[PDB]
């Protein structure tokens, strides 16, 4: 058992397009509240992003609004995931 | 030893310290702190849970 919902100052993004850069996550996530940091770790199989990224808000309540409005929605021509950076896990484990 | 030095701040690291929040670069094998980056201690815990096929990179290791 657990809560029906949760919030945090940081949240996860995945399934984004192959041409997405850290500037896209800012312009895509800014209307829900002010962003303060963004991160994209490097994948060594092809020297590009792993197909996911990270973003951080000025408040935890603004992250819940970014999830409530872009979760499982199209960004660059295909669906992307949006949720807190705690409950999820990569498709590689 | 005293030859250790961070690529982004004047601080350094011990040869046996593992309680400090730090990551290793995937392209030049150099260590880094969380405070000399735009990162935060909450985002550091998820980076630790990512698969080893993905890793952090210096302010230049991401472009060159």
């Amino acid at each position: 058992a657990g809560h029906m919902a949760t919030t945090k100052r940081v949240l996860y993004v995945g399934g984004l397009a192959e041409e997405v850069d850290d500037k896209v996550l800012h312009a895509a996530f800014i209307p829900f509240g002010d962003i303060t940091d963004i991160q994209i770790p490097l994948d060594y199989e092809t020297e590009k992003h792993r197909g996911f990224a990270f973003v951080e808000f000025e408040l935890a309540e603004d992250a819940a609004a970014a999830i409530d409005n872009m979760n499982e929605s199209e960004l660059f021509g295909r669906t992307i995931r949006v949720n807190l950076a705690k409950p999820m896990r990569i498709k590689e484990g | 030893a005293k030859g250790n030095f961070c690529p982004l701040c004047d601080k350094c690291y011990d040869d046996d310290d593992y309680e400090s929040k730090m990551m290793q670069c995937g392209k030049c094998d150099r260590w880094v702190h969380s405070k000399c980056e735009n990162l935060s201690d909450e985002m550091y815990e998820i980076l630790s849970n990512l698969p080893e096929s993905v890793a952090y990179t210096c302010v230049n290791c991401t472009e060159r």
């Binding site: 484990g93 | 593992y18 730090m22 290793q24």
Partner: peptide, 13 residues
């Protein structure tokens, strides 16, 4: 990623 919080062959346990 490679860190001081973890460096095992896998994140499982």
């Amino acid at each position: 990623a490679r860190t001081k919080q973890t460096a095992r062959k896998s994140t499982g346990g």
